[PDB]
């Protein structure tokens, strides 16, 4: 709209391109969304907690759709490429988790999924804080939840805890724990390190529309293996992140509680600009 200007694209979303942009009559800096309903995103503007991107305005113009967002510093991707020689430490990791349960709790309290979260829609800011962006609108496969690739439609909250714990992951051993170039591929990648789930793990899994009964069949991996040098304590709240079963999956709200954050603080990070 003839009300913005356009600094530079930030980035693709799921639904829409967005830019950096000023917004003349505030002048404030501005995350402009073009998508590609009215009413599912109008309750989305109402959606306000510290740990998600503010909903500022929407604008439904000329049968066209913007949605204005406050602007945040930069994504955690970015600060992850940035980080990946000596790590991110492990004080500003657990504080992040933490911070992300919190919204991710919040979410699910108002039944709002997020379903695509990944590292480029985590937003962090210079004062230690981190947030969910690019959310309850409704391609990088790395962190989709196992029932979304056998084919269930009806899926849970679940799934952003299961992608919260592949970011998890990724942000302790500086590498993608299934970096799938295809749905088959993302599939057997899971199933290679958590081994083929059966029904004894997962109740219903031969029952879902994609599954084969062809599936090779691969041993469990030990985690310690998998998330070297995360503690007992920080391996045991992502073994339960990542659990086949999306009702054993543990909650955003329970894994509040979990001993992982006894001593969590909230650092402030170390970030270029
Ligand atoms: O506020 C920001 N800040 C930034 C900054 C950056 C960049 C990307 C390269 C360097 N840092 N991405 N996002 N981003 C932002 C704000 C509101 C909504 C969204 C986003 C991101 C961009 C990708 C999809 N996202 C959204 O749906």
């Not at 309850?136 to 962190?143: C, F, K, M």
């Not at 170039?181 to 199933?191: H, P, V, Y």
């Not at 007992?232 to 001993?259: C, F, T, V, W």
Request: charged share 25%.
């Amino acid at each position: 709209m003839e009300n913005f200007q356009k600094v530079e694209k930030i980035g693709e979303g799921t639904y829409g391109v967005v830019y950096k942009a000023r917004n003349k009559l505030t002048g404030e800096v501005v995350a402009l969304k073009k998508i590609r309903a009215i009413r599912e995103i109008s309750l989305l503007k109402e959606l306000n907690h510290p740990n998600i991107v503010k909903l500022l305005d929407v604008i439904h113009t000329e049968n066209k759709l913007y949605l204005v967002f406050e602007h945040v510093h930069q994504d955690l991707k970015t600060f992850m490429d940035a980080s990946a020689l000596t790590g991110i430490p492990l004080p500003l990791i657990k504080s992040y988790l933490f911070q992300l349960l919190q919204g991710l709790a919040f979410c699910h309290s108002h039944r709002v999924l997020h379903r695509d979260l990944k590292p480029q829609n985590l937003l962090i800011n210079t004062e230690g804080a981190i947030k969910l962006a690019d959310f309850g609108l409704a391609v990088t496969l790395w962190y989709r939840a196992p029932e979304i690739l056998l084919g269930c439609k009806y899926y849970s909250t679940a799934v952003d805890i299961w992608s919260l714990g592949c970011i998890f992951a990724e942000m302790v051993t500086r590498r993608a724990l299934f970096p799938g170039d295809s749905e088959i591929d993302q599939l057997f990648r899971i199933f290679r390190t958590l081994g083929t789930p059966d029904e004894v793990v997962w109740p219903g899994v031969t029952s879902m529309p994609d599954y084969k009964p062809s599936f090779p069949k691969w041993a469990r991996q030990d985690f310690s293996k998998v998330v070297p040098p995360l503690d007992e304590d920080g391996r045991s709240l992502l073994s339960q992140m990542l659990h086949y079963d999306p009702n054993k999956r543990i909650s955003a709200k329970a894994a509040l509680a979990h001993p992982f954050f006894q001593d969590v603080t909230k650092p402030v990070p170390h970030l270029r600009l």
